[PDB]
Design a protein around this nucleic acid. Structure first.
Ligand code: SF4
Length: 374
DNA sequence: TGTGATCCGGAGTCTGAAACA
DNA sequence: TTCAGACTCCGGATCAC
């Protein structure tokens, strides 16, 4: 019964990692998101070799330029994408990089889907056995294991665990451990889907925050006693702007879509009399984001572009008694957490927010963050 | 046959050199 | 002080020998 010890040692290590990151990085438990499965496949296409914020902004640009005229409904007109020339769809996702190659891959995927089934949809893939779905997804040109595992785990709710560069490095550095896939998949094949989802989410966030490739924050890492690099060893990055929290009954939020039932964070107002409103990411996207919105943090807000360009004149009486919270502006998640102490990261993730984007409400497209904020 | 390169590509940080002295 | 190149980012395909 060696496998009895094989699964027990990893389960104890995995649950210790999950419990510790719960206090530091907030609640990463599974919560459903809307959207179809073709959105997830295109997202995994767009996340090949690029940072997460760039890929998410590229998908937002795809949604904005091609708009729709767990509710499994398309947010993007994929028929128009297949109709659109490779040059224009490469222009849409230029900022992500590899625009032309990925545009051709996406057009080929959509064309093959139409040829196979006569319609761009993959809802029936949740009814087939998991292995058949994995083989069908692997049969596509431009998709490999790391992607199809992400698609299955985050969208099809199967039992899967993708091993990307961040996961492998963390596993090697910690007491754990295609070679990494062979070591981990048999040892991590029978666990609850919610547990796999939470582990994956906290692993990617931990790779972004504490355990980076260059100069990991080993001083403030909660896993110092369980690591090997720490065992063997022995600002312009972020701008903080204190803001006000706006209850949904406030007059300023009269025409702001009245949030979402499942959104865990409220609206914010960033005063410079004049203020800019910060719209939460889940509310701004109205759910319906690929891969269960694991591209954003739990405490992530956008910046209203119209409010940023022309701040709204507000009286000081309306915002007199509202509580005050930080936002920790910046340009990327890894940069704004560099050098931060454990208490600061915990406070930011539990009683704080994070903004690295600007959102245009009218066009639903990403915009660069304004100069004064960062 | 099993890696081992070389490609794709924008956007950012970060060094090292070439600079003040 | 300027400043350009290497490197990193939730990766596949195509040769080469
Ligand atoms: S101690 Fe350092 S190397 Fe180890 S897991 Fe933490 S950040 Fe990564």
């Amino acid at each position: 019964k060696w496998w009895e010890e094989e699964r027990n040692v990893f389960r104890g290590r995995a649950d210790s990692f999950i419990a510790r990151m719960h206090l530091v990085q907030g609640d990463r438990r599974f919560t459903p998101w809307k959207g179809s499965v073709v959105d997830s496949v295109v997202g995994v296409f767009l996340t090949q070799n690029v940072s997460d914020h760039l890929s998410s902004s590229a998908f937002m640009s795809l949604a904005s330029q091609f708009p729709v005229p767990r509710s499994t409904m398309d947010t993007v007109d994929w028929k128009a994408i297949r109709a659109a020339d490779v040059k224009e769809v490469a222009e849409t996702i230029k900022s992500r990089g590899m625009n032309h190659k990925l545009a051709e891959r996406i057009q080929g995927f959509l064309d093959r889907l139409v040829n196979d089934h006569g319609s761009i949809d993959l809802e029936w893939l949740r009814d087939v056995p998991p292995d058949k779905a994995k083989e069908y997804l692997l049969s596509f040109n431009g998709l490999g294991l790391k992607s199809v595992e992400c698609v299955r785990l985050l969208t099809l709710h199967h039992l899967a665990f993708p091993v990307n560069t961040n996961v492998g490095r963390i596993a090697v550095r910690l007491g754990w451990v295609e070679s990494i896939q062979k070591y981990l998949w048999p040892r991590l094949c029978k666990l609850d889907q919610k547990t796999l989802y939470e582990l994956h989410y906290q692993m990617i966030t931990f790779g972004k925050v504490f355990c980076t490739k260059s100069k990991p924050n080993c001083n403030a890492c909660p896993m110092k006693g369980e690591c090997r690099h720490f065992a063997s060893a022995f600002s312009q990055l972020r701008t903080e702007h204190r803001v006000y929290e706006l209850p949904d009954e406030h007059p300023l939020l009269a025409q702001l879509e009245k949030r979402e039932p499942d959104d865990p964070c409220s609206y914010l107002l960033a005063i410079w009399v004049r203020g800019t409103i910060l719209i939460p990411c889940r509310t701004a996207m109205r759910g319906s984001f690929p891969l269960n919105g694991t591209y954003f943090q739990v405490n992530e807000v956008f910046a209203d572009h119209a409010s940023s360009l022309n701040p709204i004149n507000v009286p000081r009486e309306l915002i007199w008694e509202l509580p005050r919270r930080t936002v920790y502006f910046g340009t990327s998640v890894p940069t704004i957490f560099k050098g931060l102490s454990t208490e600061k990261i915990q406070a930011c993730f539990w009683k704080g927010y994070v903004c690295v984007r600007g959102f245009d409400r009218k066009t639903r497209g990403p915009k660069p963050l304004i100069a004064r904020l960062h």
